[PDB]
Symmetry: C2
């Protein structure tokens, strides 16, 4: 039931705008991935408001759900949604008071996936590791997903590596909404997505960033 419109190799283009604390910025990105293998790479440019006065890491999860390897016959909410596409909306709450919300539209245009993202980041502590750029990327994580009243609810927790060897914890809560009529969708049951979000390259005081994700959907895997 995955859309035939999602091929083995797919390109993406993204536009992102928002504010973190009081700081306005815009990014664009281009990427390529293998939707059925759950892998993708994005090459990202900060085009307004750079270099950013906050850790780029807080933007990482806002740059792609079509590129999850849905194993074990798990119905794929995201690949099913095409050609109509889907949205997502999310809050990430950091233990030390910062919050980042994002709202995103995913469409498919002329064979290319198009992402449009709006970011609102608020109350990050002025002397904390995000605003002081003391962060070193994300540990691997697992999202749990299950049907919401409409759409799909996701929850995860993530750990941000800090200089000096410690961690900053956060929680993520998401709702994914399909633009495909509900009667044309086979909804999954409860399941997990295991993912690794890895930094490949950064240049020019983090105004150019390459990042990669691997994401695989499964049920529980312990006897």
């Amino acid at each position: 039931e995955d859309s035939e419109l999602i091929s083995e190799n797919m390109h993406m283009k993204l536009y992102m705008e928002g504010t973190v604390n009081d700081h306005h910025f815009k990014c664009t990105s281009e990427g390529e991935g293998k939707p059925y293998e759950g892998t993708q790479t994005m090459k990202i440019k900060v085009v307004e408001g750079g270099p950013l006065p906050f850790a780029f890491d807080i933007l990482a999860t806002s740059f792609s759900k079509t590129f999850i390897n849905h194993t074990q016959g798990i119905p794929d909410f995201f690949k099913q949604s095409f050609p109509e596409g889907f949205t997502w909306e999310r809050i990430t709450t950091y233990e030390d008071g910062g919050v980042l919300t994002a709202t995103q539209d995913t469409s498919l245009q002329n064979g290319c996936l198009i992402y449009n993202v709006k970011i609102n980041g608020v109350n990050f502590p002025s002397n904390g590791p995000v605003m002081q750029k003391k962060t070193l990327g994300w540990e691997a994580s697992t999202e749990m997903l299950y049907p919401a009243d409409s759409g799909l609810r996701g929850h995860s927790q993530m750990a941000l590596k800090l200089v000096g060897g410690g961690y900053l914890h956060c929680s993520l809560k998401t709702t994914y909404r399909s633009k495909k009529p509900a009667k044309n969708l086979k909804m999954p049951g409860f399941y997990f997505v295991d993912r690794k979000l890895e930094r490949i390259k950064e240049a020019d005081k983090e105004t150019y960033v390459e990042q990669h994700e691997m994401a695989v959907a499964r049920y529980c895997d312990l006897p």
Copy 2:
């Protein structure tokens, strides 16, 4: 040491844009108030995305800190900030899972206060009173304000009255940031702002709302 640029009667103009869940909208408003008496009225129009599929009440606090009567000699962070102006950034968390963040710029242009607001609301329950438009306005509230590492931190709790006679609780956490050099500012200590938010009139499924606020700053009122 308030700015002489803030007179006894001031006008405001506002532009607001955002998304709640997946729903894009834009609002504009025109207003007037008495900054030193802590009273103001705004005439608000939904200009894109109307009628909104959520309760207007969730936008009420995003439509004005210059209009607080700062009593008891409390240094007035907002009135001192002109001509440069100030920004605010906020998360409101609802007990039933919705979150609304907002970021705001306050400027003074040709004697008129100009507000620019961006809204990101996420995860409002589909059958909850906000998305079902079963709300009846806000009870009176009190914000506590005190210096942050830079800026002014605010916290509040608010109760949204519901059709049927119950309440939906939320919490608000804000940072106000002055665009005036910190050496030219006298910071307050800890204080409270008591407020009431009311409507004068509304029409056409809340696509027109006239909102009024009275806000007075004080210290504890108990002997």
